[PDB]
């Protein structure tokens, strides 16, 4: 009674990137049962298309395992993928609990292999407990300041002086559970190229494989720390150490007291295609 | 280029029991594809049906999304259910690590709706630590004596005064996960019907809906300490307290120092079906 197909989101390859399970025609769903179906599949997060309502191309619902988020980057860009099998526009507008969120659809042959979405515009502070994190991740200090940026989300960012010290990471995942309503995102590299490991036992996930959510802001924080100018798009890879490589692109416009746009954009795959009863 | 099915386990309506994702014809799979292809669903298992090796009909593998089992209870009954799909024989003999397992299928017009398992002989000691089981739990004490039960997974099971009390449980999961490579099982009840909670981080669950693995154990525990006879069929209710209402039926025969027969039923039903492009 309802298709649904899983996209491996910021991949070009299957069993790359990060899954997510997008459900079509889900009008008929209550959000009672459209939970219930999140769970049932356990993926980080399903999606359901439903009818728009304040003039986009469709809305699109998000659930966890456990509860409906409002937004939530690599789950989106995955239905906007997903999507663009059923539409011809080059552009597709997805109403959210956060708003209706811009994707260019990138086609070749008729399919999509790619989209580009805006993102909210985060806001930013210190974290304040440095020593409790650093201690945590096994680490004495951070390149650049530790701050906490929310989009939805809440992500914080603790740089690392090279891309070896950053996969040499083995943190204390009882210790970053004190860490409550955000992820852990560790970041290295230079210039247009820059590496990332996020954890978050808030969240639900060990060690993440693509963090939509998570690139937006991670390039505010290079260009706010000077690795970057605000305009400049960098390529983030990102689960390599758990065989989940990853590659989100991300650009920041404007200036830290002024951002015009978020972009975020990547890859993706379907993975499967099947029928649920219900 | 693979065809799998979504079967609630333990389950006759779609939503409840357990589910597991069985994958057909994986002959050309690569056993690092299968793990990669069951960390991609993340379901609490996904099984892959091969070609027999030692006389049986299929050789079934069973792969948690990190690990590859030798024996599992509601992956298994699953499997058998997906697999009457495609068969017409009455009884189903399917190869594991752990020997052959035989199987009794039952259909209506074609449809194989539940299915009969033997299990593996358990053997089980007393745990020994009581007192931090019981303070992790929230309670003072148990009914019957507190046995940790082997027959691939471990199984520990400490008793509860009534239903009521049961469902009360809100336990400590930090303080849970330092019992490591066990499942614990807290039940309630009395005569032929019993209710049972399962809560393992060992296992990678919070709480799990139909402990297939637990239920010819909890007949064993039963019969040892005098609740039911050797021979004696158990109708066990888990996974009420989560929404996911499973009914798992258990026998054990002969006598503890000799059993002869491990006896595990319940009903199976198909969510979904679909395809995979690897
Ligand atoms: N994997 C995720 C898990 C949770 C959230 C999240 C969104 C809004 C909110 F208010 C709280 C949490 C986002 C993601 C993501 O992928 O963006
Ligand atoms: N959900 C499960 C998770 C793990 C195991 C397990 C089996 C064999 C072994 F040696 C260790 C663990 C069984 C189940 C089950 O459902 O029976």
Request: aromatic share 8%.
């Given at each position: 009674?309802?298709?649904?197909?899983i996209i491996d989101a910021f991949a070009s390859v299957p069993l790359e990137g990060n899954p997510?399970?997008?459900?079509?025609?889900?009008?008929?769903?209550?959000?009672?049962?459209?939970?219930?179906?999140?769970?049932?599949?356990?993926?980080?997060?399903?999606?359901?298309?439903?009818?728009?309502?304040?003039?986009?191309?469709?809305?699109?619902?998000?659930?966890?395992?456990?509860?409906?988020?409002?937004?939530?980057?690599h789950?989106?860009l995955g239905?906007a993928i997903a999507?663009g099998?059923?539409?011809?526009?080059?552009?597709?507008?997805?109403?959210?609990?956060?708003?209706?969120?811009?994707?260019?659809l990138e086609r070749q042959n008729?399919s999509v292999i790619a989209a580009s979405?805006?993102?909210?515009?985060?806001?930013?502070?210190?974290?304040?407990?440095?020593?409790?994190?650093?201690?945590?991740?096994?680490?004495?200090?951070?390149?650049?300041?530790?701050?906490?940026?929310?989009?939805?989300?809440?992500?914080?960012?603790?740089?690392?002086?090279?891309?070896?010290?950053?996969?040499?990471?083995?943190?204390?995942?009882?210790?970053?559970?004190?860490?409550?309503?955000?992820?852990?995102?560790?970041?290295?590299?230079?210039?247009?190229?820059?590496?990332?490991?996020?954890?978050?036992?808030?969240?639900?996930?060990?060690?993440?494989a693509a963090?939509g959510?998570?690139?937006?802001?991670?390039?505010?924080?290079?260009?706010?720390?000077?690795?970057?100018?605000?305009?400049?798009?960098?390529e983030i890879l990102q689960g390599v150490?758990?065989?989940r490589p990853s590659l989100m692109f991300?650009?920041?416009?404007?200036?830290?007291?002024?951002?015009?746009?978020?972009?975020?954009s990547g890859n993706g795959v379907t993975f499967?295609?099947?029928?649920?009863?219900?």
């Amino acid at each position: 009674m309802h298709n649904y197909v899983i996209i491996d989101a910021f991949a070009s390859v299957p069993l790359e990137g990060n899954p997510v399970a997008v459900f079509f025609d889900a009008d008929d769903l209550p959000p009672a049962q459209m939970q219930r179906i999140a769970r049932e599949m356990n993926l980080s997060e399903s999606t359901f298309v439903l009818k728009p309502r304040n003039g986009g191309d469709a809305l699109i619902r998000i659930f966890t395992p456990v509860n409906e988020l409002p937004f939530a980057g690599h789950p989106l860009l995955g239905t906007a993928i997903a999507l663009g099998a059923h539409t011809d526009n080059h552009r597709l507008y997805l109403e959210t609990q956060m708003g209706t969120i811009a994707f260019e659809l990138e086609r070749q042959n008729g399919s999509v292999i790619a989209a580009s979405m805006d993102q909210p515009i985060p806001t930013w502070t210190a974290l304040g407990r440095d020593a409790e994190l650093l201690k945590a991740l096994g680490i004495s200090d951070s390149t650049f300041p530790i701050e906490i940026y929310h989009n939805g989300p809440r992500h914080v960012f603790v740089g690392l002086p090279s891309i070896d010290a950053l996969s040499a990471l083995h943190p204390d995942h009882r210790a970053l559970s004190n860490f409550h309503d955000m992820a852990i995102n560790c970041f290295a590299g230079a210039g247009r190229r820059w590496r990332s490991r996020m954890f978050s036992p808030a969240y639900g996930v060990v060690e993440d494989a693509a963090t939509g959510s998570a690139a937006g802001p991670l390039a505010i924080h290079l260009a706010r720390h000077g690795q970057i100018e605000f305009g400049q798009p960098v390529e983030i890879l990102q689960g390599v150490e758990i065989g989940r490589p990853s590659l989100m692109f991300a650009k920041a416009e404007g200036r830290a007291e002024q951002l015009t746009r978020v972009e975020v954009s990547g890859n993706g795959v379907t993975f499967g295609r099947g029928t649920i009863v219900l």
